[PDB]
Each structure stands twice: as C-alpha cells, then as structure tokens.
C-alpha cells in the first residue's frame, strides 16, 4: 500500500491549492 | 473506460472527482492569489515520493505492461508540478497575475489525472500478478504426481506451503477489496477448499510414499485419493483466477 498511500498524499497536497483557487 | 474500482482506490478518487469538477470551471468562473509557496512545496514533497516509489516499482517489476504504461504517468504529474512550482514564483513578485493562474488549474488538473491514471495501472499490475501466482500453484500442484519418497516429499511440501501462504494472503487482501459481494463468497469459499485439501494432499502423498516404498497394495487407492485432490483443488484455483479474471480483463480479446 506504498503507492496507494502516496498517491493519497498527493491528492491531500493538491486540496489546499484548490481552495486558494476558489478563495 | 473502467467501470468498478476496488474498496480502497474507490474511496482514494471520492474526493478527485469533486476537485476535477472545480478545475474544470476555473477557466470560465479581481484576483489575489495568497502566497502558496509552502502549500506548493508539500505538492512536490508528495510528487517525489510518488514518483520515487513509482519508479522503484518500475525498476523492480517482471511487468512489461506496468513498464511501459506507469512511465507516461510519471512526467505527466512531473510536468504538472513544475507548473505549480513555476505558478508559485511568478505569484512572489505580485499576487495578480492571470498567466501563474492558468499554471495553477493545469497543474492541480495534471496532477489529479497523472496519480489516478498510475494506481488504476498500478491496481492492474497487481490483479495480473494474483493471477501469475495461483497459475503457478496449478503449475506445481502437477509435481506432485512424481514425488515417491520421503525426501522429494520434504522437498515438495517446502516448496508448496510457502506459494500456498503467498496465495492464501493474496486472495484474502483481494477478496476484502471487491465490491461485488457475490465474488467475494466465490473467492472465499473456493480459497476455503484449498486451505482444507491442503494438509488432505499431504496425507495422501504420505500414504503414497509408505506404500510404493514399501511395498504394493494398496498403491492404487492411494494413488486414486492423490489424483482426487490435486484435481479438486486444481478445480477450485481455476475457480479463483476465473472469478479475478472475469473482472480484470482488457484489451485485445
């Protein structure tokens, strides 16, 4: 579950990004 | 193109179908962009893990189709973050500005469809490795035919019992991760016969064995017993693999 739990940082790092996108 | 995930990839792309659908509109819907370099930092912090393990799954995989398709993925969350990094250090000179906004939406977007697009790929691989592992099973269960003494007997069974293990582990973590119930009790059921036959093919080798050496009847009995549960057994793997297969199958045929 390396990749699974990789991945799923990564999609939780993008999630702020959004945010700051959408104010 | 797939319609049903497992459990645990269904609930790590929940939330990215959302986020998409909030990408997708930022081309359409004043300015201010605040900072950002310490949330973009975390983004290749988590993209160079991704990409790190990623590599060394490509590095140390017997796989030629994962070779070939996770690779792509790669530079497409690669590319994607340097946008973002890029988009972060034009936003440090002023926060309004329209060409670091545009590097903002393609990168998160870049991002969300490279890691979704290498766990699919990844999940693939892993269902084709199952299926290389209960083949093998069925492989060596056949060997079993020429074991004749007590040494090929010890031989046998350390070699079987540990691939039995590494099967049994596989489809109990595969089965769990199904969403189609009815699969779940067809993979069950038919790794419960496997794991109940398994000590039952051991003691009719070992019959076998004391019988042919030494010495006749009744060789035929135990020899019929023998044959009987490689075969039940050899049934209920093809049960497996056809039940993972059934499932997993892509394109050709």
Redesign the interface.
């Given at each position: 579950?390396?990749?699974?739990n990789?991945?799923?940082?990564?999609?939780?790092?993008?999630?702020?990004?959004?945010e700051?996108?959408?104010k | 193109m797939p319609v049903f995930h497992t459990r645990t990839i269904e609930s790590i792309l929940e939330p990215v179908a959302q986020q998409i659908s909030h990408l997708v509109i930022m081309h359409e819907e004043g300015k201010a962009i605040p900072d950002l370099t310490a949330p973009v930092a975390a983004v290749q912090a988590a993209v160079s893990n991704l990409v790190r393990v990623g590599k060394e799954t490509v590095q140390t995989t017997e796989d030629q189709i994962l070779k070939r398709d996770m690779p792509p993925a790669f530079i497409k969350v690669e590319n994607a973050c340097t946008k973002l990094v890029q988009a972060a250090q034009m936003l440090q000179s002023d926060p309004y500005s329209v060409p670091a906004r545009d590097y903002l939406i393609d990168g998160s977007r870049g991002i969300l469809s490279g890691t979704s697009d290498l766990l699919l790929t990844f999940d693939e691989a892993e269902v084709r490795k199952i299926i290389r592992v209960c083949k093998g099973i069925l492989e060596y269960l056949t060997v079993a035919e020429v074991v004749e003494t007590m040494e090929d007997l010890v031989t046998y069974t350390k070699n079987l019992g540990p691939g039995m293990t590494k099967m049994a582990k596989m489809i109990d973590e595969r089965q769990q991760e199904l969403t189609h119930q009815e699969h779940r009790v067809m993979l069950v059921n038919s790794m419960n016969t496997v794991k109940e036959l398994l000590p039952v093919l051991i003691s009719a080798m070992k019959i076998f064995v004391t019988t042919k050496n030494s010495k006749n009847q009744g060789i035929e009995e135990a020899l019929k017993n023998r044959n009987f549960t490689v075969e039940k057994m050899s049934a209920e793997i093809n049960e497996i693999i056809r039940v993972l297969q059934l499932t997993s199958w892509d394109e050709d045929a």
């Amino acid at each position: 579950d390396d990749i699974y739990n990789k991945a799923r940082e990564v999609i939780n790092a993008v999630n702020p990004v959004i945010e700051a996108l959408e104010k | 193109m797939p319609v049903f995930h497992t459990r645990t990839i269904e609930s790590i792309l929940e939330p990215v179908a959302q986020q998409i659908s909030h990408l997708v509109i930022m081309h359409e819907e004043g300015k201010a962009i605040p900072d950002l370099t310490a949330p973009v930092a975390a983004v290749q912090a988590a993209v160079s893990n991704l990409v790190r393990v990623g590599k060394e799954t490509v590095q140390t995989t017997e796989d030629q189709i994962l070779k070939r398709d996770m690779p792509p993925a790669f530079i497409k969350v690669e590319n994607a973050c340097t946008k973002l990094v890029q988009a972060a250090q034009m936003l440090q000179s002023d926060p309004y500005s329209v060409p670091a906004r545009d590097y903002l939406i393609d990168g998160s977007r870049g991002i969300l469809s490279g890691t979704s697009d290498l766990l699919l790929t990844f999940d693939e691989a892993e269902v084709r490795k199952i299926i290389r592992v209960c083949k093998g099973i069925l492989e060596y269960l056949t060997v079993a035919e020429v074991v004749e003494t007590m040494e090929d007997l010890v031989t046998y069974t350390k070699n079987l019992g540990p691939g039995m293990t590494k099967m049994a582990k596989m489809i109990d973590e595969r089965q769990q991760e199904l969403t189609h119930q009815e699969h779940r009790v067809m993979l069950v059921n038919s790794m419960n016969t496997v794991k109940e036959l398994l000590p039952v093919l051991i003691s009719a080798m070992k019959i076998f064995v004391t019988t042919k050496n030494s010495k006749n009847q009744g060789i035929e009995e135990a020899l019929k017993n023998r044959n009987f549960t490689v075969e039940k057994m050899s049934a209920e793997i093809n049960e497996i693999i056809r039940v993972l297969q059934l499932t997993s199958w892509d394109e050709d045929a």
